[PDB]
Design a protein around this ligand. Structure first.
Ligand SMILES: CCCCCCCC/C=C/CCCCCCCC(=O)OC[C@H](COP(=O)(O)OP(=O)(O)OC[C@H]1O[C@@H](n2ccc(N)nc2=O)[C@H](O)[C@@H]1O)OC(=O)CCCCCCC/C=C/CCCCCCCC
Ligand SMILES: CCCCCCCC/C=C/CCCCCCCC(=O)OC[C@H](COP(=O)(O)OP(=O)(O)OC[C@H]1O[C@@H](n2ccc(N)nc2=O)[C@H](O)[C@@H]1O)OC(=O)CCCCCCC/C=C/CCCCCCCC
Ligand SMILES: CCCCCCCC/C=C/CCCCCCCC(=O)OC[C@H](O)CO
Ligand SMILES: CCCCCCCC/C=C/CCCCCCCC(=O)OC[C@H](O)CO
Ligand SMILES: CCCCCCCC/C=C\CCCCCCCC(=O)OC[C@H](O)CO
Ligand SMILES: CCCCCCCC/C=C\CCCCCCCC(=O)OC[C@H](O)CO
Ligand SMILES: CCCCCCCC/C=C\CCCCCCCC(=O)OC[C@H](O)CO
Ligand SMILES: CCCCCCCC/C=C\CCCCCCCC(=O)OC[C@H](O)CO
Ligand SMILES: CCCCCCCC/C=C\CCCCCCCC(=O)OC[C@H](O)CO
Ligand SMILES: CCCCCCCC/C=C\CCCCCCCC(=O)OC[C@H](O)CO
Ligand SMILES: [Ca+2]
Ligand SMILES: [Ca+2]
Ligand SMILES: [Cl-]
Ligand SMILES: [Cl-]
Ligand SMILES: [Cl-]
Ligand SMILES: [Cl-]
Ligand SMILES: [Cl-]
Ligand SMILES: [Cl-]
Ligand SMILES: [Mg+2]
Ligand SMILES: [Mg+2]
Ligand code: NA
Ligand code: NA
Lengths: 200, 200
């Protein structure tokens, strides 16, 4: 009675490690594990394509992992660490905005992103929460990120190898308590998207 | 900026209420809000069909809400209130099993359930957590529920009117701190499916 076992691919195990790291970010109150979740979220689609184990089941599991790691966990990390009515409302809006763009992304098959992608949104909020000691500013930022995530601002999907290279390293630095470089790279990505949008 | 507003239906707002209650179950450490999420989870599809606003975006938001309310939140409630390594492992397995059945059911389209549905799994775990004061027993039960959820045990999606009637009342009693009746009804449903499976 565990016929589900015949649908699991090797890339699905990468996705489950992502679900584990995203859940443990909440359970253990760990910003560090958010950064690791971004790494696994990049690794699981890569493994699927390289091993030839792409599947509809895995595509769904990948999105479900995003809910955990990048919708719920950052909203929890905001409220847990900046406990306040404003952080409560903002965590709600953040999580809701993550949910809405994942549902839109789930019915879309376009080559870029429409709105800021949810791992970028999660990175911004978590980096802000670690380096800004103000519940008010961080609660404002959560809303701004939420609005960016459900927006029509176009964002590119494939950073070239140079950007991958230095972003990968910045994420591991963030895992070990130095998130500045990852947050700065992620801000440049987000802000450039907005400027292009306003400029036309 | 926000073309997404043109695809949001009235039934999505019910789904959004569900995401809010599921998130707040975590943020506020609230067993009550799990039972309310089950109520909202039944109402959002009902409203979609009665109002003729069934949509693919809404079907995706419905499953995303389930991740939050019924995969992450019960796992968090277990570990947060029975903090221990065994509960940490059991929370992971429960949440992973919820994710796997949601990925499977996202690619499925059968009239019944295959495996124990995830709102029923969440009800069992949180009911057990409220009434059983043992981290070992509840950690065991979390695994058993996870295994049920990913199993091939067939489960009816046909609660006729009398069952809905009393289940709905029992859920509201659970919201106000009396979960025995909801837990009992859910266990009967769960155990019945097991018996029919073994009986062949
Ligand atoms: C443990 C530590 C290990 C050491 C680490 C070693 C290196 C690890 C690689 C990490 C690479 C780091 C790069 C991360 C990329 C990322 O975020 O991916 C997440 C994520 C991409 O993943 P995704 O959307 O899920 O797609 P992907 O996972 O490849 O594949 C999805 C499909 O893959 C198939 N799949 C997936 C999982 C599965 N189990 N089965 C499947 O069949 C299915 O067909 C899926 O539909 O989103 C992003 O890329 C957001 C971009 C954020 C912006 C970056 C910040 C700015 C950076 C530089 C500044 C430049 C500014 C520009 C200005 C000019
Ligand atoms: C407000 C607070 C107070 C108001 C009181 C309101 C009155 C009643 C509330 C009804 C709740 C009671 C019924 C709950 C049933 C339930 O669990 O629903 C969750 C869950 C909800 O169903 P679902 O899987 O999400 O489907 P549903 O939401 O109806 O529809 C999904 C589709 O609806 C469309 N949709 C959905 C959302 C959306 N935003 N847009 C859409 O287009 C899409 O096409 C979706 O694909 O159903 C179950 O899990 C069934 C199994 C539950 C276990 C039963 C436990 C034991 C029961 C009885 C005892 C057994 C033996 C007793 C004998 C003695
Ligand atoms: C920390 C994780 C980071 C990502 C790690 C990526 C690992 C992907 C390996 C692919 C090797 C080729 C795949 C060949 C089949 C898997 C190996 C195997 O022998 O299968 C064992 C079993 O079926 C179940 O893994
Ligand atoms: C230490 C943690 C991070 C370290 C980095 C880990 C990621 C390396 C994974 C590479 C993909 C696996 C490569 C295997 C490619 C061939 C496997 C295979 O059998 O695929 C058949 C063929 O490709 C059908 O298309
Ligand atoms: C810069 C050199 C690269 C650095 C290595 C990158 C590769 C990732 C490897 C392991 C991550 C596992 C570490 C996760 C530790 C768990 C943290 C935890 O338990 O959190 C509790 C609390 O919040 C206190 O932080
Ligand atoms: C149908 C309705 C569905 C949703 C129903 C959920 C309602 C949640 C109620 C109160 C939230 C808690 C706010 C309490 C206000 C401050 C009181 C306090 O104790 O301060 C600490 C606070 O938790 C620091 O944010
Ligand atoms: C409108 C739909 C009908 C159902 C009703 C759903 C209302 C929205 C649901 C949850 C919001 C939870 C609110 C969380 C904040 C608690 C109130 C608070 O403490 O902050 C507010 C203000 O600062 C001083 O009250
Ligand atoms: C007797 C049957 C009739 C009852 C019908 C009820 C219908 C739902 C109405 C309001 C739910 C609001 C729930 C708000 C719960 C507060 C959660 C909270 O603040 O949590 C703090 C602490 O953890 C403690 O749970
Ligand atoms: C707060 C208390 C909570 C419990 C209360 C639950 C209330 C939900 C009941 C009915 C909603 C649906 C009403 C149907 C309105 C139909 C409007 C419409 O668009 O008609 C389309 C047609 O029916 C098809 O194409
Ligand atoms: C491949 C890259 C790594 C991927 C791996 C991702 C998961 C590892 C992250 C955190 C695990 C740390 C959890 C530590 C929890 C310890 C809490 C505990 O129970 O401590 C014992 C107790 O306090 C005394 O009885
Ligand atoms: Ca991915
Ligand atoms: Ca539903
Ligand atoms: Cl199975
Ligand atoms: Cl998108
Ligand atoms: Cl995304
Ligand atoms: Cl939009
Ligand atoms: Cl099913
Ligand atoms: Cl389900
Ligand atoms: Mg993912
Ligand atoms: Mg739902
Ligand atoms: Na796959
Ligand atoms: Na809908």
């Amino acid at each position: 009675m565990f016929s589900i076992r015949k649908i699991i691919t090797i890339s699905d195990y990468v996705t489950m490690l992502n679900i584990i790291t995203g859940l443990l970010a909440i359970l253990l109150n760990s910003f560090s594990l958010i950064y690791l979740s971004i790494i696994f979220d990049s690794l699981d689609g890569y493994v699927a394509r390289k091993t030839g184990t792409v599947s509809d089941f895995g595509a769904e599991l990948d999105s479900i992992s995003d809910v955990v790691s990048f919708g719920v966990a950052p909203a929890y990390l905001l409220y847990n660490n900046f406990e306040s009515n404003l952080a409560l409302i903002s965590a709600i809006i953040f999580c809701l905005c993550g949910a809405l763009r994942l549902a839109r992304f789930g019915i879309l098959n376009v080559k870029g992103f429409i709105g800021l992608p949810i791992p970028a949104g999660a990175l911004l909020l978590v980096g802000f929460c670690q380096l800004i000691n103000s519940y008010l500013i961080n609660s404002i930022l959560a809303i701004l990120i939420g609005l960016l995530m459900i927006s029509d601002i176009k964002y590119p999907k494939y950073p070239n190898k140079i950007f991958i290279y230095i972003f990968a390293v910045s994420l591991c630095l963030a895992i070990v308590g130095i998130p500045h470089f990852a947050l700065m790279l992620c801000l440049i990505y987000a802000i450039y998207g907005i400027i292009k949008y306003i400029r036309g």
